[PDB]
């Protein structure tokens, strides 16, 4: 039963550990009942413990401890009784979160002599609500009391449905014993108290800790204060337990304006101002051996002077010494737990808090500070006192001894002894301790599918003869200044009068910018914003496709936000809503209506805008749904006179826009029927549009509509990896986009079409690799294989249809065959296989390629081979 | 000429709602109104969005006073509230009756001068409209959540309401009152009853079956209609029987119903929604149940290569309806190789009966709680007033009042529509 | 029961109401004590109903849309001169009320607030009381009559007999200590319009 040896300890802990494991399986009602019985047993025993605390400690006063043994039970209960601390605290079912709050284990309670019983009723009683255990290592001066404070708690818990040794205490303490308890393995936490050396040794143990320092507690009394209650509260805080209590106001800092008044008001109401010889004698007994006399602590005032060598009335509550030094040389400013007090003299407020912060900074860093002022009309002072004072508790118009243990003067403050002083003091709690610190929360995280979107430009218009019907719809009914962006071949050949012809004839002012060439550079973009910033357009228009529709919707940026650094605008990301350079909201200065005369790109719907740096020459595909065209237009009358090449490269980038959008990882049921309806039109009408041309406008139109439909697909289901390398392959060699996508898709499919790949994209919605299947759902949709095929022929037949399609469009079989030299390829292939993996298009490819696996399907194309793996 | 216009945002996955308000509402607005029905105010569905707004600097107000087949009395009631709270955003919720009522309150809030009769005016085209609707993005935006899987009102301009005086649902329409955002999360329909997952998920079958065949049908609004049809075939039965026990199906169907809205918002409905609206406001039959009884005949109606009339649309040169209804089956698998374009429809209609039998759908209107005396007496009314609905100005054979009644009756007596 | 509360509602409205007007939120204690007083008076007049000032006020503040408190501040300084007549025309016929004591109660009020000097005669304690109101109505922005309160002499005299007969028909007046005559109400309506007194 008794504990004065190191083995008795190692036995106790075990018969305790085994209580917890039996106590942890308890419910809320089975412990809500243990919590009361232990709190009553502690309240009804408020007087005796307070007697047993003075007989043994030699300090304190009875009637002021009784407010503590009682506060530590009633004011603890009213607060932590309804705190759900057993199981599920919260359950957000929209998400998949649940907080379950298992306990922590067992604890070591390091008790002081200052508050031996309250600090025990407080910990004992709070460690039962969290379904924990605890073991006390008390102070020799108060071992009999704080251990009689737990038996009065335990013997009332076991009587309420608890085990019989859940709690434990050391009877004959030491260092060899505590240091053997704090370092015990079956312990799981340390709940300490007692100032420096204590917390310096709690954390240093090896276990966690909620140790708690302590020290000075400056209090400031400004001109705009109620010097009456400022003083009573100063005395009601020192004399309370004779200041032995922590946080008590060891030092006031008054401003000259009201010092004399305060000086007297302290005198009449039991204040002896240490004027001369008395003072020195008093600041000589305080500090013994660099520390405060351990015999003066908690003792009444008149009992101070006797040790000093003088005498004062027995009714004196306090001993005040008017001083100026605010450093360590003055022992009259350290953490004297006596009723003594230091009275400083300051010019104004700012001169005080500068002085307070200086003497909290010496012994009481982080604990608490106080202020007395107009709590309602001087909120800036407050704001200036909280932002300047490095204390975890700033107590405005409250006494510290009864506001730091806070449920009396202020609510919303966690009632507690064991007041955290923040890392400033050497403890990482920063708050009044409670049961939510003795607790191991834990979070079950159900798989949540990542949110998706089908976002387009409103006002898509599509048929032959749709320009004037559209401009005169939403543009002219509205804006007044336009900026048509296009290329020369369209400005020269009357593709841009067909649009000004309509704006003119109404009130509008046009200005065309036609210095855009294939693969636009950032130099052309600036030059376009440099113009937009002069013409100040109310709207922006973009013709052709790709180069214009990619230079314009970015010129739309530099016009509304010229501070945009392309280096940050083209930063590769991992998710498009968790973007690190969130695009600015740009639809205010001007809109970005878009027209297209080129089939494939589909840029008229999608956020993508491919441009190159003009310094490194790397195409930086940059993406955000803020640069959607805002009323795209797609008229098939601007395509019927296209050459045979641009038709192929276009309609053949659209194929690889849907192919790697039906198979992508962001694919959905919204973007999977459009991709197919595109891929089914590019099969019935694409060859015709190449051979026949304008002679079959029915086909030249569908292809134009399809290539846009893919946009609806790959605007939401981003591209795959064929573009991540086609952008680099089409830059280091100036190969066109569509021609590059054609030389890879018949080797990229068979890359992604492995159900046992080396990697995978880590997308929640992506259960497992479906690409091999997601590619056969294509063939069966086109009509390649009806009868019961292996799912591997449906692919061979998909490729075959491509090699057949790439044949009847003049597409070469390889790059070598496309105007590239093995000497210039092998050299800068490792460079653009890395710069491909670092593209934003590849973050959606189902297989998450390895640099060592793009290089291979990048050589196998130069030599017209097949990636076999 | 044609178009394909929708909101500039359609967020859709289980758990998207907070991730559709934590994103956009609070980034732009601080005064929100919510429109719904009592079942959702009560059952804690509207405090799934007020939770996340109030947590921000937003002030909410909920107009929970909506009823099935909404009236113009409620609409004017919510405007008074909207005129008092002065919202920066409107958030419709509940599906259909609320959504169809909030986007019209949006009107009476932006422009209280309006007169409902000038909105319910049928027309020959949407551009060549006499009452050009006003611009509505200036006072408050309009969000649209949904809790049913059969309407598509999240995307479409259709806003069906009732005068409360004549009792005539006026399926008015204009893209100016499309929502700015549409949120379709299955978190809200997992616990939906069977009487709704059937009617709702079975109108959607029409939203898409008289949209892939309509004259305004385009390549844009044909793959979506189909994808809304290949999902309502593999997941609608399961979402009825298994219910929440197959949330993937109860989710895919929820997206399909919306995808069909991506279709019939661009390619208007045909004739089943004209006779439905009038046949479901008189006899107070629900929407989806009026569409499931007729669709299996309207097909037999529109699938006549030699009808009396076409709808006179340039893009529609020859009647192709008998063909489109075949590509449907050819896409769903009902079709066997070596057919003749006449059985693919039988194999299609066969898939519906098979689908209407396994959802609790009757075989006629008589079985649906309508007395032969209350029908034949007012059939010529809803047969002349269907012709006067805006939805029928898009179906491919411009029905005759001679020919509508005949299919009303053949759906009462469970008969077919031979000709 | 309802006499110490009424008074405590009156010793606080005298030491803290002026300060809560001028200083406003800069003296929240007064802006607080006054808030409690107003309620303590509710602890009184909930049990001991109002008199006649709230009858004429309600009718005089619904016709001319004058606020409640402003209709009560213009009249109270006369109703006192009315109820403080030891020999009125009528009493309110209440058993607990044997003799008219109103001229006396209004003195214990002053005697409690300090307005009274030792050696008075029960006739000045009321003057010293009314003097405290004017002094209090002048320092809150309260006018000296109804005319100054935005009411045209033509719109008043034309409908005075209405609100003078309809005040008598209010429930509040069935508790004041001298059962006013319609002859006597109008006279104090008008003397509050022309800022005059209510001699008799
Ligand atoms: N912030 C609070 O909650 C609070 C409350 C009351 C008192 N206090 C502070 O407590 C202190 C009271 O003085 P005390 O009574 O703590 O005297 P003290 O500071 O000597 O406390 C010594 C305690 O340390 C324990 N201990 C265990 N292992 C130790 C080790 N390795 N090295 C040193 N000590 C070890 C001893 O058992 C003993 O109880 C003051 O600083 C007072 O401000 C803080
Ligand atoms: N954002 C997207 O949606 C997306 C996706 C993939 C690729 N891209 C980018 O799109 C760009 C492709 O641009 P494009 O290839 O679409 O055209 P392009 O911009 O290369 O220029 C095509 C050239 O063909 C000629 N031309 C254009 N329209 C014509 C017409 N109607 N009749 C006759 N000649 C005509 C002009 O000389 C024009 O410069 C590449 O930079 C590619 O990376 C964009
Ligand atoms: Fe492309």
What distance lies between CA C106 and its chain's CA centroid? Answer: 11
Asked if residue A592 lies in contact with residue A559, where contact means CB atoms within 8 angstroms, the answer is no
Asked if residue A126 lies in contact with residue A151, where contact means CB atoms within 8 angstroms, the answer is no
DSSP secondary structure code for residue A682 in this structure: T
Asked if residue A390 lies in contact with residue A360, where contact means CB atoms within 8 angstroms, the answer is yes
Taking the CA atoms of residue A21, residue A22, residue A23 and residue A28 in that order, the dihedral angle to the nearest 10 degrees is 110
Strand partners, A742: none
CB atoms within 10 A of CB B226: 22
Residue A205 φ then ψ, to 5°: -70, -55
Asked if residue A288 lies in contact with residue A270, where contact means CB atoms within 8 angstroms, the answer is no
State the burial class of residue A732 (Cβ atoms within 10 Å of its Cβ: 0-12, 13-18, 19+): buried
What distance lies between CA A431 and its chain's CA centroid? Answer: 21
Strand partners, A419: A432
Q: Determine the Cα–Cα distance for residues C161 and B160; give it in Å rounded to an integer.
A: 58
Give, for A168, the enclosing helix (H) or strand (E): strand A167-169
A9: region left, alpha or beta (phi > 0 left; psi from -120 to 50 alpha): alpha
Q: Determine the Cα–Cα distance for residues B265 and B128; give it in Å rounded to an integer.
A: 17
Residues in chain C: 200
**Superfamily of the domain at A218-425:** Aldehyde Dehydrogenase; Chain A, domain 2 (3.40.309.10)
Asked if residue A32 lies in contact with residue A13, where contact means CB atoms within 8 angstroms, the answer is no
Report strand pairing: A134-137 vs A167-169.
Answer: parallel
Contacts of A331 (CB under 8 A, 6+ apart): A283, A284, A286, A287, A292
From chain A, pick out residues whose CB is under 8 angstroms from the CB of B184.
Answer: none
CB atoms within 10 A of CB A734: 12
> What's chain A's Rg over C-alpha atoms?
40
Q: CATH assignment of C1-200?
A: 1.20.1090.10
Residue A784 φ then ψ, to 5°: -75, -40
Question: Is B220 near chain A, with CB under 8 Å?
Answer: yes
Q: Which ligand is nearest to the CA of A619?
A: 2
Report strand pairing: A318-322 vs A167-169.
Answer: unpaired
Question: Is A453 near chain B, with CB under 8 Å?
Answer: yes
- Domain made up of B1-193: CATH architecture: 3-Layer(aba) Sandwich (3.40)
Asked if residue B13 lies in contact with residue B183, where contact means CB atoms within 8 angstroms, the answer is no
Residue C92 φ then ψ, to 5°: -90, 5
What distance lies between CA A46 and its chain's CA centroid? Answer: 46
Q: Is the dihedral of CA A404, A406, A412, A416 positive or negative?
A: positive
Which residue carries 């076999």 as its tokens? A868
Hey, what are B1's tokens? 């000429």
What are the angstrom distances between the C-alpha of C85 and each of B321, C111, C123, C191, C200?
101, 19, 10, 17, 9
A734: region left, alpha or beta (phi > 0 left; psi from -120 to 50 alpha): left
3-state helix, strand, coil split of chain A in percent (to 5) is 45, 10, 45
Give the Cα-Cα-Cα angle A147, A148, A152 (nearest 5 degrees).
120
What's the A213 CA to ligand 1 centre distance in angstroms?
A: 8
Asked if residue A867 lies in contact with residue A856, where contact means CB atoms within 8 angstroms, the answer is yes
Q: Is B215 annotated as a binding-site member? A: no
Q: What is the largest CA-CA distance in chain B?
A: 66
What distance lies between CA A855 and its chain's CA centroid? Answer: 38
Deposited resolution, Å: 3.4
Strand partners, A462: A634
A344: region left, alpha or beta (phi > 0 left; psi from -120 to 50 alpha): beta
Residues in chain B: 419
Question: Is B250 near chain A, with CB under 8 Å?
Answer: no
Query: C26 vs chain A: nearest CA distance in angstroms?
Result: 6
Q: Which atom of ligand 2 is nearest to the CA of A545?
A: 16
Hey, what are A412's tokens? 């919303």
Portions of chain B given CATH number 1.20.1090.10: 194-419
Q: Determine the Cα–Cα distance for residues C26 and C19; give it in Å rounded to an integer.
A: 9
Taking the CA atoms of residue A810, residue A815, residue A820 and residue A823 in that order, the dihedral angle to the nearest 10 degrees is -160
Strand partners, A539: A591
What distance lies between CA A842 and its chain's CA centroid? Answer: 27
Fold for the domain defined by B194-419: Dehydroquinate synthase-like, alpha domain (1.20.1090)
DSSP secondary structure code for residue A506 in this structure: S
Q: Determine the Cα–Cα distance for residues A736 and A744; give it in Å rounded to an integer.
A: 13
- In the three-class reduction of DSSP (H, G, I as helix; E, B as strand; rest coil), residue A99 is classed as strand
Q: Nearest CA to A216 among A326, A347, A345?
A: A326
Asked if residue A509 lies in contact with residue A475, where contact means CB atoms within 8 angstroms, the answer is no
All partners of chain B with 3 or more CB pairs under 8 angstroms: A
DSSP secondary structure code for residue A642 in this structure: -
From chain A, pick out residues whose CB is under 8 angstroms from the CB of C19.
Answer: none
* Cα-Cα end-to-end distance for chain C: 33
CB atoms within 10 A of CB A160: 18
CB atoms within 10 A of CB A356: 27
What burial letters (b/e) apply to B173-186, b meaning 16+ CB within 10 Å?
bbbebbbbbbbbbb
Hey, what are A491's tokens? 């400005």
A519: region left, alpha or beta (phi > 0 left; psi from -120 to 50 alpha): left
All partners of chain C with 3 or more CB pairs under 8 angstroms: A
Asked if residue C100 lies in contact with residue C77, where contact means CB atoms within 8 angstroms, the answer is no
Q: Determine the Cα–Cα distance for residues B157 and B264; give it in Å rounded to an integer.
A: 10
What are the angstrom distances between the C-alpha of B134 and each of A409, A480, B104, B106, C163?
59, 20, 12, 11, 51
Hey, what are B361's tokens? 């759908």
Contacts of A470 (CB under 8 A, 6+ apart): A459, A461, A631, A633
Count Cα neighbours of A542 within 13 Å in the Cβ-side half-sphere: 33
- In the three-class reduction of DSSP (H, G, I as helix; E, B as strand; rest coil), residue A514 is classed as strand
Residues in chain A: 869
Hey, what are B339's tokens? 């057919």
State the burial class of residue C98 (Cβ atoms within 10 Å of its Cβ: 0-12, 13-18, 19+): exposed
Q: Is the dihedral of CA A56, A58, A59, A62 positive or negative?
A: positive
Question: Is A756 near chain C, with CB under 8 Å?
Answer: no
How was this entry determined?
A: cryo-EM
CB atoms within 10 A of CB A583: 17
Which residue carries 């019927």 as its tokens? A640
SS3 track for chain B: CCECCCCCCEECCCCCCHHHHCCCCCCCCCEEEEECCHHHHHCCCHHHCHHHHHCCCCEEEEECCCCCCCEHHHHHHHHHHHHHHCCCEEEECCCCCCHHHHHHHHHHHHCCCCCHHHCCCCCCCCCCCCCCCCCCCCCCEEEEECCCCCCCCCCCCCECCECCCCCCECCECCHHHCCCEEECCHHHCCCCCHHHHHHHHHHHHHHHHCCCCCCCCCHHHCHHHHHHHHCCCCCHHHHHHCHHHCHHHHHHHHHHHHHHHHHHCCCCCCCHHHHHHHHHHCCCCCHHHHHHHHHHHHHHHHCCCCCCCCCCECCECCCCHHHHHHHHHHHHCCCCCCCCCCHHHHHHHHHHHHHHHCCCCCCCCHHHCCCHHHHHCCHHHHHHHHHCCCHHHHCCCCCCHHHHHHHHHHHHCCCCCCC
Q: Determine the Cα–Cα distance for residues A595 and A629; give it in Å rounded to an integer.
A: 9
Q: Nearest CA to B187 among B67, B30, B12, B324?
A: B12
Q: Determine the Cα–Cα distance for residues C52 and C29; give it in Å rounded to an integer.
A: 32
DSSP secondary structure code for residue A73 in this structure: I
What are the angstrom distances between the C-alpha of B123 and each of A676, B158, B174, B207, B391?
34, 14, 11, 20, 10
Question: Is B47 near chain A, with CB under 8 Å?
Answer: no
* Cα-Cα end-to-end distance for chain A: 73
Hey, what are A92's tokens? 């957000």
Q: Is the dihedral of CA A243, A246, A247, A253 positive or negative?
A: positive
Asked if residue A319 lies in contact with residue A296, where contact means CB atoms within 8 angstroms, the answer is no
Strand partners, A137: A110
Q: Determine the Cα–Cα distance for residues A449 and A763; give it in Å rounded to an integer.
A: 8
Asked if residue A468 lies in contact with residue B9, where contact means CB atoms within 8 angstroms, the answer is no
Asked if residue A273 lies in contact with residue A322, where contact means CB atoms within 8 angstroms, the answer is yes
Q: Do chains C and B meet with 3 or more Cβ pairs nearer than 8 Å?
A: no
Give the Cα-Cα-Cα angle A229, A231, A236 (nearest 5 degrees).
90
Asked if residue B152 lies in contact with residue B204, where contact means CB atoms within 8 angstroms, the answer is yes
Q: Which ligand is nearest to the CA of A202?
A: 1
Give the Cα-Cα-Cα angle A658, A663, A668 (nearest 5 degrees).
85
Q: In what order do the strands lie in the sheet with A167-169?
A: A167-169, A134-137, A108-110, A190-191
Q: Is B77 annotated as a binding-site member? A: no
Following DSSP, what letter does each residue of A554-585 receive, concatenated? Answer: HHHHHHH-TT--HHHHT---S-SSS-SSPPP-
Q: Determine the Cα–Cα distance for residues B36 and B32; give it in Å rounded to an integer.
A: 13
Asked if residue B67 lies in contact with residue B123, where contact means CB atoms within 8 angstroms, the answer is no
Q: Determine the Cα–Cα distance for residues A784 and A794; give it in Å rounded to an integer.
A: 7
Q: Is A866 annotated as a binding-site member? A: no
Find the residues whose C-beta lies inside 6 A of ligand 1: A 110, 112-115, 137, 139, 173, 175, 178-179, 193-195, 197-198, 201, 212, 214, 246, 335, 417-419
Asked if residue B46 lies in contact with residue B64, where contact means CB atoms within 8 angstroms, the answer is yes
What's the A546 CA to ligand 2 centre distance in angstroms?
A: 4
Q: Determine the Cα–Cα distance for residues B216 and A642; give it in Å rounded to an integer.
A: 28
Q: Is the dihedral of CA B55, B61, B65, B66 positive or negative?
A: negative
Q: Determine the Cα–Cα distance for residues A862 and A813; give it in Å rounded to an integer.
A: 9
**Superfamily of the domain at A6-204:** Aldehyde Dehydrogenase; Chain A, domain 1 (3.40.605.10)
Q: Determine the Cα–Cα distance for residues A588 and B305; give it in Å rounded to an integer.
A: 51
- In the three-class reduction of DSSP (H, G, I as helix; E, B as strand; rest coil), residue A833 is classed as helix
Q: Which ligand is nearest to the CA of A422?
A: 1
Q: Is C65 annotated as a binding-site member? A: no
Asked if residue B6 lies in contact with residue B265, where contact means CB atoms within 8 angstroms, the answer is yes
Query: B25 vs chain A: nearest CA distance in angstroms?
Result: 14
Question: Is B3 near chain A, with CB under 8 Å?
Answer: yes
State the burial class of residue A579 (Cβ atoms within 10 Å of its Cβ: 0-12, 13-18, 19+): middle
Contacts of B361 (CB under 8 A, 6+ apart): B198, B202, B289, B292, B293
Q: Is any atom of ligand 2 closer than 6 Å to the C-beta of A544?
A: yes
- In the three-class reduction of DSSP (H, G, I as helix; E, B as strand; rest coil), residue C13 is classed as coil
What are the angstrom distances between the C-alpha of A305 and each of A75, A329, A338?
36, 21, 12
What's the A198 CA to ligand 1 centre distance in angstroms?
A: 5
Give, for A372, the enclosing helix (H) or strand (E): strand A369-372
Sequence-distant contacts of A528-534: CB under 8 A, at least 24 apart: A528/A485, A528/A552, A528/A555, A528/A558, A529/A555, A529/A557, A529/A558, A529/A559, A529/A562, A531/A483, A532/A483, A532/A558, A532/A559, A532/A590, A533/A559, A533/A562
Q: Which residue of B4, B127, B178 is in closest CB contact with A462?
A: B4
Q: What is the largest CA-CA distance in chain A?
A: 120
Contacts of C95 (CB under 8 A, 6+ apart): none
Q: Is the dihedral of CA A634, A637, A638, A644 positive or negative?
A: positive
């Amino acid at each position: 039963m008794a504990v004065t040896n190191v083995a008795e300890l190692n036995a106790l802990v075990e018969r305790v550990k085994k209580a917890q494991r039996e106590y942890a399986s308890f419910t809320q009602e089975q412990v809500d009942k243990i919590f009361r019985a232990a709190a009553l047993a502690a309240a009804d025993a408020r007087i005796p413990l307070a007697k047993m605390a003075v007989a043994e400690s030699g300090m304190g006063i009875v009637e002021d401890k009784v407010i503590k043994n009682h506060f530590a039970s009633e004011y603890i209960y009213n607060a932590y009784k309804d705190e759900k601390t057993c199981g599920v605290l919260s359950e957000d079912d929209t998400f998949g979160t649940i907080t379950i709050a298992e306990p922590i284990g067992i604890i070591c309670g390091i008790v002081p002599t200052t508050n031996p019983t309250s600090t025990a009723i407080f910990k004992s009683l709070i460690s039962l609500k969290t379904r924990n255990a605890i073991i006390f290592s008390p102070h020799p001066r108060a071992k009999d009391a704080t251990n009689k404070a737990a038996d009065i708690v335990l013997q009332a818990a076991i009587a309420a449905g608890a085990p019989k040794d859940l709690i434990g205490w050391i009877d004959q303490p030491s260092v060899e014993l505590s240091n053997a308890l704090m370092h015990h393995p079956d312990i799981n936490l340390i709940l300490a108290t007692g100032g420096p050396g204590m917390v310096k040794a709690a954390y240093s143990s090896g276990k966690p800790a909620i140790g708690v320092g302590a020290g000075n507690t400056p209090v400031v009394i400004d001109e705009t204060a109620d010097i009456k209650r400022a003083v009573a509260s100063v005395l009601m805080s020192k004399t309370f337990d004779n200041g032995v209590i922590c946080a008590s106001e060891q030092s006031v800092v008054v401003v000259d304006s009201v010092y004399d008044a305060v000086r007297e008001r302290f005198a009449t109401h039991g204040g002896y101002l240490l004027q001369g010889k008395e003072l020195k004698a008093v600041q000589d007994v305080i500090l013994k051996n660099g520390a405060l006399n351990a015999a003066i602590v908690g003792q009444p005032a008149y009992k101070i002077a006797e040790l000093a060598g003088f005498s004062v009335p027995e009714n004196t509550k306090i001993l005040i010494g008017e001083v100026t030094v605010v450093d360590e040389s003055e022992p009259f400013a350290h953490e004297k737990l006596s009723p003594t007090l230091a009275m400083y003299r300051a010019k104004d407020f700012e001169d005080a808090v500068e002085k307070a912060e200086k003497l909290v900074a010496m012994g009481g860093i982080g604990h608490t500070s106080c202020l007395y002022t107009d709590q309602d009309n001087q909120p800036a002072r407050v704001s200036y006192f909280g932002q300047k004072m490095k204390t975890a508790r700033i107590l405005i118009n409250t006494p510290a001894s009864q506001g730091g243990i806070g449920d009396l003067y202020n609510f919303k403050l966690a009632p507690s002894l064991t007041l955290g002083c923040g890392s400033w003091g050497g403890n990482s709690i920063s708050e009044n301790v409670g049961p939510k610190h003795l607790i191991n929360k834990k979070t079950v995280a159900k798989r949540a599918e990542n949110m998706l979107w089908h976002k387009l430009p409103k006002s898509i218009y599509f048929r032959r003869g749709s320009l004037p019907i559209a401009l005169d719809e939403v543009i002219t009914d509205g804006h007044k200044r336009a900026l048509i962006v296009t290329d020369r071949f369209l400005f020269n050949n009357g593709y841009a009068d067909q649009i000004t012809s309509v704006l003119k004839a109404a009130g509008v002012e046009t200005e065309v910018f036609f210095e855009v060439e294939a693969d636009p550079t950032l130099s052309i973009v600036r030059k376009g914003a440099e113009l937009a910033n002069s013409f100040k357009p109310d709207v922006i228009i973009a013709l052709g496709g790709g180069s214009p529709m990619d230079a314009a919707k970015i010129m739309w940026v530099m016009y509304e936000h010229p501070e945009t650094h392309f280096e940050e605008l083209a930063l590769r990301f991992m998710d498009i809503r968790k973007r690190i350079y969130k695009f600015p909201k740009m639809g205010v200065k001007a809109k970005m209506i878009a027209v297209t005369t080129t089939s494939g790109t589909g840029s008229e719907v999608t956020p993508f805008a491919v441009v190159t740096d003009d310094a490194t020459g790397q195409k930086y595909p940059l993406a955000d749904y803020a640069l959607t065209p805002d009323m795209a237009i797609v008229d098939a009358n601007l395509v019927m006179d296209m050459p045979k090449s641009l038709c192929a490269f276009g309609g053949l980038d659209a194929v690889t826009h849907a192919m790697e959008a039906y198979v992508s990882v962001l694919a959905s049921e919204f973007s999977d029927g459009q991709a197919l309806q595109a891929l089914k039109l590019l099969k019935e009408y694409l060859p015709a549009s190449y051979h026949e041309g304008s002679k079959n406008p029915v086909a030249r139109e569908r292809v134009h509509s399809a290539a846009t439909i893919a946009g609806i697909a790959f605007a939401n289901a981003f591209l795959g990896v064929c573009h991540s390398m086609a952008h680099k392959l089409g830059s280091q060699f100036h190969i066109p986009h569509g021609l590059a996508n054609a030389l890879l898709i018949c080797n990229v499919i068979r890359y992604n079409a492995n159900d046992n790949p080396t990697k995978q994209t880590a997308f929640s919605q992506y259960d497992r690799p479906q690409a091999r299947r997601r590619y056969a759902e294509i063939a069966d949709h086109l009509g390649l294989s009806a009868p019961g095929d292996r799912t591997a022929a449906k692919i061979e037949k998909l490729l075959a249809w491509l090699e057949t399609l790439k044949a009847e469009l003049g597409i070469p079989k390889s790059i070598r065959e496309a105007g590239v030299q093995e000497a210039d390829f092998l050299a800068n292939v490792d460079k653009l296989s890395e710069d491909a993996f670092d593209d934003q298009c590849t973050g959606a490819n189902p297989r998450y390629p390895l640099i060592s696996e793009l290089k291979q399907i990048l050589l196998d194309t130069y030599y017209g081979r097949d990636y076999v793996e």
